[PDB]
């Protein structure tokens, strides 16, 4: 309408480049930018993500902006350093951000993306309650080894949650160890790092569930988890990442009788000689 | 002023790093002179010097001529002093000329005191020769180039680096477990390790084939950015 | 036969290839003596020898002792002869001991004439010293270790390979355009190029960290199989 051409942006969005046009205003942090955008109607607001701790206040600011100000406003989050997860990006999109620009894209790509959102309106629904959006960041809250029943119950509870992305809740992996090493030794060589990762052993298999991991980025997660390369420890791998597949595997895992389950268990030296 | 780059082991990338650092320093506005002290004479080929150009400071001193006429100008702020091509017989018996190259110390002292050059990079070999010791003695600062591998890890515990030398990492791979272990151990143990390292980049492999420094060959490459960071570090720390 | 392995430059993999070749030859049933002539003394570590073990033939001859006592028995078909540890003063002053090691040539000749060892592998540096030349003259055959890069392409055109030496390629990488171009040129220009090449395999990087030869450390690695192919080629072609 009046400030459609206006582009309210953070200083760090431009890595020292001058204001590209007359319609650019540069702010120091994403607080004065929020206050100035409160008065704006159809402008473009380009935040900046430097560190991980900024996601929640930024989500609150985006939520307030998309609620008080309608669908005309364009909200962009320019990520400057690798300080974001897929779940956080989903949260920011849900709160009312048009799109999140990755740090991999250089400045020119970011400017083209800013041009991309012009003339567009935010038609997605933003819920009034903000806590129900933050609750979707990590719904499991359980780490490490779990017994078979507890593991199955936790994963099944996660699958039945309606406030979670479809087919993107996590990955269920069944690992069959190579002959010569038991499943308990594989469990010892297994140190999940995140809060939503759980492991269990049963029937000569090691079963993992990685929360919100995508199927493509599964080898990276496994490399983080295990100390030795994955491939010298296990012979075969079965993966379920769709909701129907995970549910079917869980209901096929509950019909495993106990006594088949498991719990953690409590070089040549050269010698001198005379050559002759 | 005088910055000597020496490799803990051959093949680590001392020559290409020296050429790239000279290019970055001259891009930052510094007058740079590169001296090739390695008898193999490979630094000249990174500055578009023909392979048949036998002249150099060492060859001039051996033939009795003046080494000041053996200098080459690349840009207005970058000068090159090649070693010169030695014959096969000279390479086979290095002891016949290793003691005849002493005046280069006085010449480098004169160039340092002249003030025409703000940086004098010296590409030093690793042969424990007398000339290399003298050139290291006249160097104000030293950079030891290593690769993250078992060989350099062993060498850092059994051979003496130049006093005050800082260790620079080159040929850093992605997804190498043993490399990661050695790198973490160095971060927690090596006090002289610089905060900057150079990743294995195809640009550094192609720059010598294109007869250009990596900054000139491909300024957008990651190794060029890392060399620029190293040049900024040298300007901020090794200036005085 | 006495086989001497040398590299056109440091860091090509001569010590690792020497250890792997010795292991593969002893795996085929051939008695092997592996001799390190490099003063860096890094070949002993591939055979689980302690770092603090300072005994070696060069240190034996520099202390007035007998150099035969410094041998080590790794397997029943493999003996190791370390160079020995040199102090920092001796490392930085190579002229005071490089002329005193000449006694090794007669001993190596008598070891060859004894007939106990069917293969005597020598790891040679490229320091252009008297000992290197003498030991390389003692070699019945020799291998030149190169990597496919611009540095080795330049070196092969400006330095003399040993007479009759064959070129062995190490650290053959994946997805390097310049490497492919240089290898295409070498397939036509180079006549002493061996038909087998070693790849850039993480097993070779890890073997020295585990203080084992690559065949012992990881027998399913491609590098171990290629070293076995090299050993078969040496049996068929370097028998006498």
């Amino acid at each position: 309408r009046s400030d459609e051409k206006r582009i309210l942006s953070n200083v760090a969005v431009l890595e020292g480049a001058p204001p590209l046009s007359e319609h650019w205003q540069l702010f120091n942090n994403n607080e004065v930018l929020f206050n100035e955008a409160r008065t704006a109607q159809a402008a473009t607001v380009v935040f900046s993500l430097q560190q991980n701790a900024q996601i929640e206040p930024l989500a609150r600011s985006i939520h307030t902006l998309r609620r008080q100000r309608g669908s005309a406003m364009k909200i962009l989050v320019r990520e400057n350093t690798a300080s974001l997860r897929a779940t956080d990006e989903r949260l920011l999109l849900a709160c009312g951000a048009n799109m999140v620009i990755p740090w991999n894209a250089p400045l020119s790509r970011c400017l083209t993306m800013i041009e991309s959102v012009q003339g567009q309106k935010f038609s997605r629904y933003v819920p009034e309650d903000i806590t129900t959006l933050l609750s979707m960041t990590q719904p499991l809250k359980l780490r490490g080894f779990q017994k078979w029943d507890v593991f199955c119950n936790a994963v099944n509870n996660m699958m039945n949650n309606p406030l979670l992305p479809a087919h993107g809740k996590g990955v269920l992996v069944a690992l069959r160890p190579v002959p010569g090493i038991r499943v308990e030794q594989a469990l010892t060589l297994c140190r999940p790092n995140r809060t939503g990762d759980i492991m269990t052993i049963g029937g000569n298999r090691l079963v993992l569930f990685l929360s919100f991991c995508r199927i493509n980025d599964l080898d990276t997660a496994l490399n983080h988890i295990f100390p030795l390369p994955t491939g010298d420890i296990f012979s075969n791998r079965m993966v379920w990442f769709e909701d129907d597949q995970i549910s079917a595997e869980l209901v096929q895992m509950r019909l495993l009788a106990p006594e088949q389950w498991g719990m953690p268990l409590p070089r040549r030296i050269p010698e001198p000689m005379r050559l002759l | 002023a005088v910055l000597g780059l020496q490799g803990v082991r051959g093949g680590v990338g001392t020559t290409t790093i020296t050429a790239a650092l000279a290019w970055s320093l001259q891009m930052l506005g510094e007058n740079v002179l590169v001296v090739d002290a390695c008898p193999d004479n490979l630094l000249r080929l990174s500055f578009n010097v023909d392979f048949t150009h036998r002249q150099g400071w060492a060859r001039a001193m051996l033939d009795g001529q003046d080494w000041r006429d053996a200098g080459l100008r690349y840009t207005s702020q970058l000068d090159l002093l090649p070693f010169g091509q030695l014959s096969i017989e000279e390479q086979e018996n290095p002891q016949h000329w290793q003691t005849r190259l002493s005046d280069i110390c006085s010449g480098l002292q004169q160039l340092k005191a002249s003030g025409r050059y703000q940086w004098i990079l010296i590409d030093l070999p690793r042969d424990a020769s007398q000339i290399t010791h003298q050139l290291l003695s006249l160097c104000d600062h030293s950079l030891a180039i290593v690769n993250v591998d078992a060989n350099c890890h062993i060498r850092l515990h059994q051979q003496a680096l130049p006093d005050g030398a800082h260790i620079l990492i080159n040929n850093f791979r992605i997804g190498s477990q043993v490399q990661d272990d050695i790198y973490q151990l160095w971060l927690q143990s090596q006090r002289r390790l610089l905060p900057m390292l150079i990743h294995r980049d195809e640009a550094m492999a192609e720059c010598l084939a294109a007869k250009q420094p990596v900054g000139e060959y491909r300024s957008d490459a990651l190794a060029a950015e890392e060399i620029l960071t190293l040049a900024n570090w040298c300007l901020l720390n090794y200036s005085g | 036969a006495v086989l001497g392995l040398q590299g056109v430059r440091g860091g090509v993999g001569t010590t690792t290839i020497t250890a792997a070749l010795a292991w593969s030859l002893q795996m085929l049933g051939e008695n092997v003596l592996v001799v390190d002539a490099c003063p860096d003394n890094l070949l002993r570590l591939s055979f689980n020898v302690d770092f603090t073990h300072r005994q070696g033939w060069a240190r034996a001859m520099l202390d007035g002792q007998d150099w035969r006592d410094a041998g080590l028995r790794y397997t029943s078909q493999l003996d190791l002869l370390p160079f020995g540890q040199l102090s920092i003063e001796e490392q930085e002053n190579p002229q005071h001991w490089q002329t005193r090691l000449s006694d090794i040539c007669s001993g190596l000749q008598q070891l060859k004439a004894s007939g106990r060892y069917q293969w005597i592998l020598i790891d040679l540096p490229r320091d252009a010293s008297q000992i290197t030349h003498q030991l390389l003259s003692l070699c019945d055959h020799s291998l030149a270790i190169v990597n496919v890069d611009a540095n080795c392409h330049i070196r092969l055109h400006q330095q003399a390979l040993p007479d009759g030496a064959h070129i062995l390629i190490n650290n053959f990488r994946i997805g390097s355009q310049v490497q492919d171009d240089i290898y295409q040129l070498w397939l036509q220009s180079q006549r002493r190029l061996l038909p087998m090449l070693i790849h850039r395999d993480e097993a070779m990087a890890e073997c020295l960290a585990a203080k084992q030869p690559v065949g012992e450390y990881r027998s399913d690695a491609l590098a171990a199989e290629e070293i076995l192919t090299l050993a078969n080629w040496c049996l068929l072609n370097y028998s006498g």
Partner: peptide, 29 residues
């Protein structure tokens, strides 16, 4: 060179790395 191997066993990742590779462990003692 300046080598500081004191208090090297107080970190889990370094302990695992030293366990895996005998060379690093041999140097770190």
């Amino acid at each position: 060179p300046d080598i500081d191997y004191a208090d090297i066993s107080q970190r889990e990742q370094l302990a695992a790395a030293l366990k895996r590779w005998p060379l690093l462990a041999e140097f770190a003692q």
